[PDB]
């Protein structure tokens, strides 16, 4: 569920994701069209494809579990959705913890103008 996308973004990269990641670049927070602005927001671009790849399942309220071995995640056992949802966010979260050294503030609330064309998944 994006609570829980939320809540792991926040203990990966120690960022809150409202407003970090809510608005950020042309793919983070709300999805669409342009190039991607930098790392942070690829990881998004390639977040919504992942979304993208599960057609009927419902990302944004299905709850899934996870684990922590040592700092690893480990998506655990629910339904196929759930398992597949778990695998998107858990690789975003770990993107986003990837690229924090080039998060730039710069594109928070990023206006959606600015991002223009088809870019495929
Ligand atoms: C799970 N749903 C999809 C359609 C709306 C959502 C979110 C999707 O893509 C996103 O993750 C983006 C953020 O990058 C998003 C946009 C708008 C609302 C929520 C999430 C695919």
């Keep these: 569920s994006l ?3 939320g809540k792991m973004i926040l203990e990966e990269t120690g960022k809150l994701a409202i407003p ?3 608005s ?3 793919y983070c927070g709300w999805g669409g069209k342009g190039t991607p602005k930098d790392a942070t927001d690829r990881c998004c671009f390639v977040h919504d494809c992942c979304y993208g790849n599960l057609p009927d399942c419902n990302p944004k309220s299905d709850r899934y579990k996870y684990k922590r071995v040592n700092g690893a995640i480990v998506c655990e056992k629910g339904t196929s959705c759930e398992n597949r949802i778990c695998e998107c966010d858990k690789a975003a979260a770990i993107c986003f913890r990837q ?3 080039t998060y730039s503030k ?3 609330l990023y206006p959606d103008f600015l991002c223009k064309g088809e870019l495929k998944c």
């Design 3 to 5: 609570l829980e996308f």
């Design 20 to 22: 970090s990641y809510s």
């Design 24 to 26: 950020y670049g042309c």
């Design 99 to 101: 690229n924090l050294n």
């Design 106 to 108: 710069k594109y928070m």
